[PDB]
Every structure is written in C-alpha cells, then in structure tokens.
Amino acid sequence: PNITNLCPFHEVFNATTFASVYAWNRKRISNCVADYSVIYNFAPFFAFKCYGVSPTKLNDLCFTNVYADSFVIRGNEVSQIAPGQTGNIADYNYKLPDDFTGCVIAWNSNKLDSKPSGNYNYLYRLFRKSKLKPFERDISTEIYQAGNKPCNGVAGPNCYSPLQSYGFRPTYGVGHQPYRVVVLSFELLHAPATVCGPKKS
Amino acid sequence: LTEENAKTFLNNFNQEAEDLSYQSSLASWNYNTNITEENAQKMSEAAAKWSAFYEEQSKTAQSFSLQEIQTPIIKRQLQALQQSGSSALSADKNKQLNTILNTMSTIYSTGKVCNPKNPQECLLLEPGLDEIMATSTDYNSRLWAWEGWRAEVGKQLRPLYEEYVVLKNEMARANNYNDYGDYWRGDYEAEGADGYNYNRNQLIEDVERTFAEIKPLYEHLHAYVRRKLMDTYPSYISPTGCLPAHLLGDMWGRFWTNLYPLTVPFAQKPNIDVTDAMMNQGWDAERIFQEAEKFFVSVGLPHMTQGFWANSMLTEPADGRKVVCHPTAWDLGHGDFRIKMCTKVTMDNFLTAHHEMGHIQYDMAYARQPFLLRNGANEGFHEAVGEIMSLSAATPKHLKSIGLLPSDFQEDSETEINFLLKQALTIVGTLPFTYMLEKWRWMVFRGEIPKEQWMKKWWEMKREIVGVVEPLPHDETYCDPASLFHVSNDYSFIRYYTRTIYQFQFQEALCQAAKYNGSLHKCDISNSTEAGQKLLKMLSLGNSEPWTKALENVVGARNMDVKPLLNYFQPLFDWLKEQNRNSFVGWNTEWSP
Ligand SMILES: *[C@@H]1O[C@H](CO)[C@@H](O[C@@H]2O[C@H](CO)[C@@H](O[C@@H]3O[C@H](CO)[C@@H](O)[C@H](O)[C@@H]3O)[C@H](O)[C@H]2NC(C)=O)[C@H](O)[C@H]1NC(C)=O
Ligand SMILES: *[C@@H]1O[C@H](CO)[C@@H](O[C@@H]2O[C@H](CO)[C@@H](O)[C@H](O)[C@H]2NC(C)=O)[C@H](O)[C@H]1NC(C)=O
Ligand SMILES: *[C@@H]1O[C@H](CO)[C@@H](O)[C@H](O)[C@H]1NC(C)=O
C-alpha cells in the first residue's frame, strides 16, 4: 500500500530549541511509519551507538512504541549516555537501564547552542540526594542540603543550588562544546506493534 | 562529615571557577592581542570578578580543618584554595604594600641614566642600555652604564626595599611562615606518603648540595672566560682575580650568552644556524608550528587541537592592532589552548615554538585533573618540559631528519665544542648568579644579614660564589640587587636553578628511555613512543601528586641531581680541562685588577 504518515523525526532531530539534560524532552512516537533514513542523513554524527539492535535492521523491524529523548550535554559527557555508566549526567540527569534497547545519537551544535557572551540556558543537575532511576526526570530546584544544618530555602554555607549552568562558548575545546543528543528507545509490549518501516513493490 | 562537605564544596566550586577563569583568560587574551583601552578595562573587570570570587570561596574554604581530611587529592585542592596570599594583612598594610610594589614597577620601567657631559643622550634600560651591555666592548662605557644604573636605581630603591622587606615579612608571618623566604620556599613543599615528603628548609641544603659539584665545571668555564676576556681587555682583568661586574654581557651578569663572540673556541667553524635554509625552502610560521606538532606526535604526545590552529596568533597581525611581542602559551580553560607568538622565520623562533608547544602539551595533559590541580608539579617543571623539547629539536640529527640541514653533513668535534660552550654560557653561567641572588634574598628576609650591612655582604658573596668582583666600591646607600627585574617586581628566582637541573634530568631519563647510545648533547627523542609515554605519565599528573613522585616517575629519583647536567657538558668539561693546564683555575676574593 502507499507509503504515508511517516513518523515525525524531522521535528526531533531539527528543533529550534532543545532541552536541558535535567528536564530532558521526551516525545512518544506511535501509529506511523518509521523512515530512519532521514535520521541517517540529518547531520554528521559523533556517535550512532545502538544498544540491542543493529543500525540496518531498524527499517525491517516493527516496534510498539518509540521514545525520542532530546537534550543538550557537553561533548565529554556523551560517553555517559550508555547503559552501566556513571557521572553527573548518568546519575543525576539522564539514566539508561542496563537492558536498554535502542540507539544514542549525538552531534556537535556549536553553530546553534554557543554564544560568545555565554549560553546560560542549558542547565544540568550537579547535586542530588540519590541517583536517578532509568528514564526518570527530576525538575526540582530544591536547595541541596549537603551538611547537617537545614538550609531553610536560602542558599548559604553548605547549601548549594543543584542546577548548574553549561556556559557554552564557541571557542571551547571539542570536549566541552554543546552536543545535541537524541536517544531512541524502542519498546515492545503485548499490544499490537504499530511502528514499523516502509514497504516496497 | 567535614570531608564530604569539602568534596561537595569543591564540586560546587570547580563549575563556577572554570567559567570565571575562562572569562578572565579570554579577556586577558583579547587585551594581549588587541591592545587598547576598552580591552584593558574589560580585562580589569573580568580579573576583578574572578579575584573577588576566588577570595569569597577562599574564606569559606578556610573554615575546613585539614586534620580530618584523609584523601590527599581533596587535601591538596583545599591547600591550593586556602592560600590567601597578600590578603592576610589589614587594608592599610595591603594598600601600602601595593603602593610600594606599584612605585617600584613604575620606577624600574621608567629607569633613566644619562650620559655625563652629553645631557641629550639619556638612555632607558629596555631599548638602549641593554644594547650597550650586550654589544659594546669599551670598558669605560660599560663602567658608566653599570655604575649609573646602579646609582640612579639603587639609591632610589634602597628605602623602598627597606619597608618592602618588613611588609613582606608581616604578610608571611600572617600566613604562618617564618619569613618571606620561607613563603617562597613553600612552593617546593610536598606533603604526601612516606619518602616523598619534602620540606621548605630542605630546599636550601639541596640547592647547596647541587651547587657543590657544578662548581668545578663553573670554575673551568670561569677561568676560560677570564682568559679570553683578558685577551679582549689587556690590563683591566687579573689572572688570579674575579671578573669585573660590567664585562659579563648583561646588565647584571645574569646570562653570559653575549660573551660568545669574545670567547668562541673555534672562530673558523660557523654555527649550526639554519635560518637561510628556512628562507630558501619557503618556510613560514605555519610550517614551523606544523613541524613542532610533527615532533610531538612522533614522540607519542597528542596532536594540536583545531581551536589551537583557529584561535592562536602565530604571526604579527599587521592589520592595525598592537600586540605583545613576547611568546606566551595560554591555557584559557575548557579545552582552549593557544599560543601568542610573533613568529619570524628564524632558527630561534623555531626552537621557541618547540618550547611553547611543550608548554601547551604540558597544559593539555593535566586537563583531566580538577581545576585547582591544573598547574605544574612545581615552578620549575613547567619550563623544564619545554626546554627539553628545545634541546632535542636543535640537534643535527633532527635538523638532518627534517631537511633543514644537508644529508651529507659532517659533525666534527669542533662544532660540538663551540655549541656546548654557547650552551654553557647560557645555562651554566646563570647558576651561580641565581644561587647567590636567592641566597642573599633568603638571608635578607630571614634577618641573617644585618640591616645596615646589606651591600657589604652581597659583594662578598659575588666574590665568593659567582667569582665576580665589583668595579667600584659601593657603600650601604646603594641597593645593587634591586636593579634586577625579578627582585624589584616581587618574583621568585630559584625556579631558574631548579629548571636548569630538572631539564637535564628529564633529558637523560628520556634518552635512556629512547635507548640512545651516544653523548647526551647529541640525543634526539624523535620517534620514541615509550619516552613519550614516560614523559606523559608525569605530564598527566599536574600538581595532584607531590613533585618528588612526578620526578621519580620520569627520572627514577626523588631529588635534584646534577649528574645529568655534568654528563651533558662532559665533552666541554674535558676540553676546558685540557686548555686550563697552564692557567690558574679559581678566583681570589680580594680585589685584583
Ligand atoms: C621519524 O620517523 C619518520 C617516519 O618514519 C622519518 O621520516 C622519514 O625520513 C626518511 C629519511 O629522511 C625519509 O626517507 C627518504 O625520504 C625522501 C623524501 O621522500 C626520499 O626521496 C628517499 O628516497 C627516502 O625515502 C622518509 O621518507 C621519511 N618518512 C616520512 C613518513 O616522513 C624521520 O626521519 C624519523 N626521524 C628520526 C629522527 O628518526
Ligand atoms: C580589536 O579591538 C577593537 C575594540 O577593542 C574591535 O573593534 C570592535 O569590533 C566590534 C565587532 O565588529 C564592534 O562591535 C565594536 O564596536 C568595535 N569597537 C571599536 C572601538 O572599534 C576590533 O574588532 C578588534 N579586532 C580584532 C581583529 O579582534
Ligand atoms: C533542518 O534544519 C535546517 C537549519 O535551519 C533547516 O534549514 C531545514 O529546513 C530543517 N529541515 C527540517 C525538515 O526541519
């Protein structure tokens, strides 16, 4: 049958504004045809690591739901978006489970997310009481109480605001430049799988 | 617990620090490479914000007590952060000390000595008097320039130094130091595991021990220089006496490198200058830095970043903006590594490019360390790791490998002898001067030298250690050390001595690593990945570990050793012994003409 109702991948890998890694954006993708070839030809990618499926077979596989998680991190932290990893991003911002089936895609975004005065609109969580569970988000801005005395809401001695700023600048080194990351998580349930690829004749 | 609070404090600190330090370094770069008033005021506010933030964090960091911190990396970071420095005094004393420092800086930079009977020929030190010290052969003109700058600087800087010593002593005793000399010797203090412990009081005796065996080589070099200068100056230099202070090629006698035309061993043999070969093959600054990068990747160290090539200035811009001519390696932060060098296509700038890229490689290697540990192991390590690259780059093997020197080049012993003598005049001749100056400053700050017997002590030690006599008697109204740039502007001077020792220690360690079987001065470390890894183990550390551990990581020793330095200058030492048989090696303390 005719190929129509393609999945909106052109709205995930090409948004005018991405999200901070602490409040990472999640888009559910269902009831459409998955043309991953647009993903392939969308930029040169610093990493297209796929955990649990092979990069080619994707189009011929049919999954029930596809989650596209989009955020901006610094280049040095791209290695942390993988199962079994530790760091500030993996423990307090974005965690992938150890049985993660999907792909992580990252590319450099100096031309879009770097400013010379400093881009202070990308934030990350540096301090959290406990590590994050997989696919969890914390948007709380509660003052991190690192000592014994109560903070009382006001920032002060041994009381640090948990969200720090990624002060991106165009002259930074390759490991510190902003990188846009889209994580595709494929899940199968008992429900009929409604996200499959294109067919030809 | 205090240690967990310190860990979270340092985590909170590094993110804000890195950003403000990058803003300060970027503003300093934008001023240094586009000198104007607006870039100066932008640099001023950036440094003001960074300094205010650093003092604000240092006051909170001093609340932590180090007796209950066990992990040595956190303890070293908190040690680095808790150094208040000059902020420990009150506002009045700090303002008075800053006033004294500023007036010393602006009276040294505007120093003026003028020709007697010729009042229009008034000379500054930086453009014209250094030319007289470097090139002129006339005894009376050098006596004039030396005595005149001594008078019109020492007479004006003696009381300034008198209260400068007292204010620096107050600042040091406010920072739990015995004197200002111990405050400077605290840069070599290493607190760590057993056997790697270094103390401030140990440094003096280590310097004296390493000067106990450089003294024969220096004595033979001094005798040879004295005989050649006696050939130059017929009756004004004595065979058994010390050298006059104004005949040493510099204003203060710091470097003897300007005595090479007068003291050349073999005048008929030319030098190993390859400037004309660079001119003939159409080399430019880009090719100079690319050859330096090729050297650093052949030895195993990483390539230069794309931001290094994009952001650095390697040429005079010539588009209307003023720049500083001095080559400087900049670690701006966040993976930004730049070099500011107005590179002309010469051999000296080629070696300088190797030196500054050695600085950048050292900076790049410890970027994985925390923010407060992104420094050198001590003040001597950073310049030694560039001087070793300058040493290996200048060898005839390296020059024949890269096409600068012809393939059929013959290395006779005479060019090795005169090259080693030029290296000795630059390197060996600065060591008694450096040791004597730092010993004088240490004993002045300690109070071992009485206040009214300053000058009489200094000219004794220059007769004893350096073997250099005063040309005219000086009383205590002079301040003869203060004519030097490093002492009138509050700079430590022992870093050059430690740099000189560490340089040859590193070179012998890397040449043993590279399995070189010849004389040490001919050694090249090109194409020796294992030597690069041996080096990079120390380079990756920064000041995270004690400097004795980093020194053991390279050379296998935990202290300064001058056996590599004497092994480097061994052919020259044998040659100088062979041509000092008839003459008298050594000097007599009493003033001999
Ligand atoms: C470090 O390693 C490099 C690479 O192994 C060495 O460069 C090589 O140097 C030799 C001799 O200079 C070159 O051989 C000759 O090259 C010319 C020009 O192409 C050619 O006409 C000759 O017939 C002969 O092949 C060789 O090409 C060159 N290789 C490269 C990749 O540059 C370098 O000399 C080594 N340095 C040291 C100090 O050992
Ligand atoms: C050198 O510095 C001057 C000012 O310090 C720069 O001139 C500024 O350029 C920007 C961008 O074009 C303008 O917005 C400013 O108004 C200019 N200021 C002045 C006073 O002219 C100049 O561009 C710098 N040159 C380089 C090569 O960076
Ligand atoms: C992708 O981004 C570029 C950059 O502005 C834009 O020109 C292009 O139209 C975008 N394409 C889609 C399909 O969104």
B523-554 burial string, b = 16+ CB within 10 Å, else e?
A: bbbbebeebbebbbebbbbbbbbbbbbbbbbb
Of the candidates A126, A158, A171, the beta carbon closest to that of B307 is on A171
DSSP H helical segments within B33-90, as ranges?
37-61, 72-81
CB B354 within 8 A of CB B292: yes
Containing structural domain, residue A32:
25-128+164-196
CB half-sphere exposure, B118, CA atoms < 13 A: 7
The Cα-based distances of B315 to B280, B337, B340, B464 in angstroms read: 19, 17, 8, 46
Ligand nearest to the CA of A15: 3
Residue A177 lies in a domain: yes
Q: How many Å apart are CA B358 and CA B166, to the nearest integer? A: 39
Q: Number of CB pairs < 8 Å for A and B?
A: 51
**Which residues approach ligand 1 with their CB closer than 6 A?**
B 298, 397-398, 401, 524, 526-527
In DSSP terms, A73 is beta-bridged to: A179
Which 3 state secondary structure label does DSSP give B394?
coil
- Residue B579: closest CA among B227, B259, B271, B248: B227
Which two tokens mark B406? 């012809």
How far apart, in Å, do the first and last CA atoms of chain B sit? 71
The Cα-based distances of B40 to A117, B413, B473 in angstroms read: 17, 52, 45
Q: Is A171 in contact with B311 (Cβ distance < 8 A)? A: yes
Residue A156 lies in a domain: no
The 3-class SS string of B408-436 reads CCCCCHHHHHHHHHHHHHHHCCHHHHHHH
Which 3 state secondary structure label does DSSP give B21?
helix
Cα of B297 from ligand 1 centre, angstroms: 15
- Residue A93: closest CA among A112, A107, A115, A78: A78
The DSSP result for A53-121, as a single string, is S-TTGGGG--BSEEEEEEEEEEGGGGGGSSTT--SHHHHHT----TT--EEEEEEE-HHHH--SS-B--
Best of B12, B309, B374 to substitute, by most chain A Cβ atoms within 10 angstroms, is: B12
CB half-sphere exposure, B555, CA atoms < 13 A: 21
How deeply is B52 buried, as exposed, middle or buried, from its count of CB atoms within 10 A (0-12, 13-18, 19+)? exposed
In DSSP terms, A144 is beta-bridged to: A160
CA-based torsion, B384, B390, B392, B394: positive or negative? negative
State the Cα torsion B165-B170-B176-B179 to the nearest 10°.
20
Residue A102 lies in a domain: yes
CB half-sphere exposure, B527, CA atoms < 13 A: 4
CB A82 within 8 A of CB A104: yes
Radius of gyration from C-alpha coordinates of chain B: 25
- Cα-to-chain-centroid distance, residue B389: 15
Q: How many Å apart are CA B145 and CA B252, to the nearest integer? A: 11
Residue A18 lies in a domain: no
For chain A, what is the domain count? 1
In DSSP terms, A47 is beta-bridged to: A106
- Residue A71: closest CA among A27, A102, A30: A27
Residue A87 lies in a domain: yes
Residue B323's H or E segment, with its range, is: none
- Residue A139: closest CA among A29, A28, A27, A25: A25
Looking at residue B342, its amino acid is C
Resolution in A: 2.9
Residue A9 lies in a domain: no
Which two tokens mark B149? 């700058």
- Cα-to-chain-centroid distance, residue A196: 23
Chain A residues within 8 A of B4 when measuring between CB atoms: 146
Q: List the CATH number of the domain containing A79.
A: 3.30.70.1840
Q: How many Å apart are CA B109 and CA B485, to the nearest integer? A: 9
Which two tokens mark B62? 């001093």
Q: Is A164 in contact with B9 (Cβ distance < 8 A)? A: no
Q: In chain B, whose CA is at the least distance from the CA of A165?
A: B15
The residues of B annotated as belonging to the active site are 356, 486
- Cα-to-chain-centroid distance, residue A191: 26
Q: How many Å apart are CA A148 and CA B476, to the nearest integer? A: 61
Tokens 């240092």, residue located:
B58
Which two tokens mark B271? 């030098």
